[PDB]
Design a protein around this ligand. Structure first.
Ligand code: CL
Ligand code: CL
Lengths: 282, 282
C-alpha cells in the first residue's frame, strides 16, 4: 500500500483519487477548499477513509508518487511541478490531455523522474492508462509507474512523446472531417463504426483484424487503392511487404502479425455473434 | 418475398445467399458444380428449400435483384455483369472489396441500375452493408436496394464512389504503420483499441464521442497539437469552427453534432460499465 499525492480536485483529479483509493492511500490537494468539498461529496463513502483532503503540500514528501491534474496550460503545469519537485524525489506524473510532455520536462529541474500519465474518463472506470514519456524520462521511473498502474488493475500502454489514443482519434477525425465536407451525414460516419468497425477493433484491434483479412489481401488491395485514387492513406506499408515475403500472410498461414491455432475463424465469428447479441445488433 | 440471383458460390456468394434466404428465394450460380456442392453443404439445412443451385443464367430474368460476388478483378466482374445486363433490367449489385464501382460502371451498357453492395464477413452475421454508388447510379436503384437490405434487417450506409469502412480502415492502418515503423509493438497498437477506443467508437462513434469530449475542447486541443507537431491529421476542421461560433459545443450545451438530454453523461458511463463487464475488462 503506497501513498499517492494528487494535485487538483477537478473532475480528473477527483477521478484519479477514486481509482487509486481502491488500493492505496491518497492525499488530494487543491488551493480551493470549495473544490475539495465538492470532491468529497462525489467520492464513494467507503473510500473516504483512504483520502486526505488538503490545501497544502506538506504531505508530498511522504508520498511514493505524485499525480498532477491541474488546468491544461504549460505554465500552470510547470509552476506546480517545479514546486513539488523540490519537496520529493518521487515520480511526478502529469495527466496531460495534449500539452507536450517534452515541453513540460524541459522546464523542470529533474525531468528524469517526470512523465505523462493519461487517464481516460472516468479514470476509475475506464481500464486504459497511457504513460507518455519525454526524451528525459528514465526507464526506472517508467517501470515503477507501469507496475503501480498494472497492480491497480489498469491496462497500461507506454508511448513516446505523444499519446497513441490522441493520434488514432485525430487520424479518424481527420478522415471523418473529409467525409463531412463531402456531404456524408454525421450519423452515417458513426454508423460504420457503431455497427461494424468498432466491434472488430474492440475484439481484434486493427492489426489483429488485418490477420483475418489477410496481409497479402491487404497489401494488394491497398496497393490497388493507392494506384487508383491515390490518397496517401492507401500507400502500402513496408513492414507488410516483409511479412508477405516470409509467407506470414495471417490467420490462413497460422501467422501474420500474430500467431493462430486451427479454430481462429470459428472463434472470431463466435465472439462477434456474442457481442452483437449483447449490443442488440443481431 | 423476392427472388435474388447470386453469382459466385465462393465464401462471399455463399454467405450472401444465406443472408438473403432468411426472407427471400435465392438462385445461387457458379460455373463450377464442385463449388455449388461445397456451398450446399455449408448452408443451414432449413434454408435449402429457398435456394436453387445452378450453373446457368436462365433464372436471371425471373429475379428482382442480382448480386455478383465473383473474383476481385475488373475484367472478370465486367464480363459477368455485361452478360447479366442483357437478360434483365433488375438492379445489379457487385460485392466489390476495393475494385472501383465507377471503373466497372463505365464499362456497362446500362450503368444507371448498377451499384456496389459491400457485405461484411460473414454476410449473414455482420449487420452493416454499404451501398457504394457510381456517378451513373440513379436514385431509384439506390432506394430499392436500400429498402431491400433494410427489410432484411441490415444496417445500411450509402456511400459515393468509395466504401467508408475501407476509408476508415486505411486511415487507421496508415497511422498504425507509422507507429510500427517508430517501434511501437503491434500488441500495444491493438490494446489502445481493444481496451478503449473500440469501446467508445462502438457505443458512440467517433463524432458522438466528440460531443462528450466537447467540440470547443477538441478544436483548441487539435489546434494546439497542429501548432506544436504539426501533423496534417491535427489540422482543425472548418465544420467544427461553425459549431463553436454557434455555441453548439456538445453534450454540455445540449447540442453539438447531436442533441442531448440532461442524463447524457450518466448514461454514457452506465453503457460503458455494462460493456466493460460483458467483455471482462472491468
Ligand atoms: Cl505548502
Ligand atoms: Cl446461361
Amino acid at each position: 500500500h503506497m501513498k499517492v499525492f494528487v494535485i487538483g480536485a477537478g473532475l480528473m483529479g477527483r477521478g484519479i483519487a477514486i481509482a487509486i483509493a481502491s488500493k492505496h492511500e491518497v492525499v488530494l490537494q487543491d488551493v480551493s477548499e470549495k473544490a475539495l468539498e465538492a470532491a468529497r461529496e462525489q467520492i464513494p463513502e467507503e473510500l473516504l477513509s483512504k483520502i486526505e483532503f488538503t490545501t497544502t503540500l506538506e504531505k508530498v514528501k511522504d508520498c511514493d508518487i505524485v499525480m498532477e491534474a491541474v488546468f491544461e496550460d504549460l505554465n500552470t503545469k510547470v509552476e506546480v511541478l517545479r514546486e513539488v519537485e523540490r519537496l520529493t524525489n518521487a515520480p511526478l506524473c502529469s495527466n496531460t490531455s495534449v500539452i507536450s510532455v517534452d515541453d513540460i520536462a524541459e522546464r523542470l529541474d529533474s525531468p528524469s523522474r517526470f512523465l505523462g500519465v493519461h487517464w481516460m474518463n472516468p479514470p476509475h472506470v475506464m481500464p486504459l492508462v497511457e504513460i507518455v514519456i519525454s526524451r528525459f524520462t528514465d526507464s526506472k521511473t517508467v517501470a515503477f509507474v507501469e507496475g503501480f498502474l498494472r497492480e491497480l488493475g489498469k491496462e497500461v500502454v507506454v508511448c513516446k512523446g505523444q499519446s497513441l489514443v490522441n493520434r488514432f482519434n485525430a487520424a479518424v477525425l481527420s478522415e471523418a472531417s473529409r467525409m463531412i465536407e463531402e456531404g456524408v451525414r454525421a450519423e452515417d460516419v458513426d454508423r460504420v463504426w457503431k455497427h461494424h468497425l468498432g466491434l472488430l477493433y474492440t475484439l481484434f484491434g486493427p492489426l489483429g483484424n488485418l490477420d483475418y483479412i489477410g496481409l497479402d489481401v491487404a497489401y494488394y488491395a491497398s496497393l490497388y487503392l493507392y494506384k487508383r485514387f491515390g490518397d496517401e492513406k492507401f500507400k502500402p506499408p513496408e513492414w507488410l511487404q516483409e511479412k508477405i515475403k516470409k509467407g506470414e500472410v495471417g490467420v490462413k498461414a497460422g501467422k501474420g502479425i500474430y500467431e493462430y491455432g486451427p479454430k481462429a475463424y470459428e472463434e472470431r465469428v463466435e465472439r462477434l455473434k456474442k457481442l452483437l447479441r449483447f449490443l442488440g445488433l443481431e
